[PDB]
Every structure is written in structure tokens, then in C-alpha cells.
Design a protein around this ligand. Structure first.
Ligand code: K13
Lengths: 99, 99
């Protein structure tokens, strides 16, 4: 599909057997999701943005379905105000910017 | 153009007669640029991102050319980690997400 940017590009995603709304975010290097109790091993990480840094948990090889498109890769989990799909998974679903 | 997302979508912009590099950021409602002198009146404002809130100067109805396309809109200037072009300007240049 084509998504215009008049409003926030929120789409439904499916992760860990759960449906969530997440932002398709070309400005985010890596996908970061609101705090959730994923199983598995993880590694601490810090990501920086407007306002400074937050601490997150980095999970590797996590399957996310984004609008029916499957993807698998790094998912970070931490106190973000919004679920964010970053470039690491956007490439995997064939997402481009166009103008 | 069509821009893939294996790398950061960085583009050259021109603002205040000056060239800069900025990030096309579909996750940003607003456009925030690093500290710079811009002519015209400005109002102090607060904006929040992943890490908290920062003080910025809001410039309204500013001319800014993004990878060859002209926009005239609101630009926030302050201690952002990188220059980010948000939806208020991405819409003006006809930018969409496609997959
Ligand atoms: C360094 C580039 C950019 C600032 C990074 N951010 C993504 C960005 O899209 C965030 C994503 C974001 C969206 C909404 C809340 C918090 C973060 N948007 C943002 O900060 O936009 C601000 C400017 O307009 C306003 O609208 C949204 C917040 C304001 S981020 O959230 O901090 C981020 C940094 C690293 C990773 N791996 C994932 C996300």
C-alpha cells in the first residue's frame, strides 16, 4: 500500500502473539517497542533521540508481522511512548520513501 | 525519488540560504534543526521525543528546500541530536511511504 503522512503512520503489527499499533518510522535505526514481557535472552542498550537517551532491552531474531508482511530481526523494548518500527524491519517489508 | 532504507534517508536541505544535511523522519510530527541563526521572529516552545523534552525556538512560515522540493512551514531550532524533517514538511513535498 501507499501511506500518506497527513497523520502519524500507525499500522497494526503482530509480535509475540500480540497485536499492537506501531509507527512506521524512517527516522529510527532500530525497532523499539513499548515495555512488554518478551521471553528470551537480551542485551542492554541505550538509544538517543530528542530529549536524550533511554535504556532498552535488545532482543535478536524476533518475528514481527507488519501489515501482513513478515519480518525478523532486532527488536528493542523499553519505556518508549510509542511502538516504533525502524529501518531494520522496514527494509525487510519492502518499504520505501517516495516523492 | 524512491528511497530505500538500508541506510539513513539523509538529504541535503537549504534553509536561510544555507545548505545542510537532514534526516527524513516519518516518526516526527515536526521538523527540528540543530542550533542556527534564522531571520524573523520566533517563539519559545517545548517538544518531546524518546528521551524527554527540549526547549526550541519556533520559526513559522520558513522557506526550506528538501532534495529539490520547496516547502514553507514551521521549523523548530534547538538541541536535537540530528536535523530531522518531519511530517509537517514531508507532506508538502508529496512524500509517502510505500510497500
Ligand atoms: C535521531 C533521529 C530520531 C530523533 C530518532 N527517533 C525516531 C523519531 O522518529 C522519533 C520517534 C518518536 C515519535 C513520538 C514520540 C517519541 C519518539 N520522533 C521524534 O522524536 O519526533 C519529534 C519531533 O516531532 C514530534 O513528533 C514526534 C515527537 C516529536 S527516536 O524515537 O528517538 C529513536 C532512536 C533510535 C532507535 N533505534 C529507535 C527510535
Amino acid at each position: 500500500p501507499q501511506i500518506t503522512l497527513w497523520k502519524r503512520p500507525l499500522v497494526t503489527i503482530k509480535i509475540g502473539g500480540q497485536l499492537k499499533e506501531a509507527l512506521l518510522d524512517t527516522g529510527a535505526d532500530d525497532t523499539v517497542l513499548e515495555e512488554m514481557n518478551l521471553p528470551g535472552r537480551w542485551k542492554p542498550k541505550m538509544i538517543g533521540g530528542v530529549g536524550g537517551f533511554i535504556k532498552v532491552r535488545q532482543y535478536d531474531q524476533i518475528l514481527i508481522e507488519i501489515c501482513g508482511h513478515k519480518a525478523i530481526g532486532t527488536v528493542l523494548v523499553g519505556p518508549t511512548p510509542v511502538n516504533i518500527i525502524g529501518r531494520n524491519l522496514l527494509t525487510q517489508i519492502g518499504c520505501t520513501l517516495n516523492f
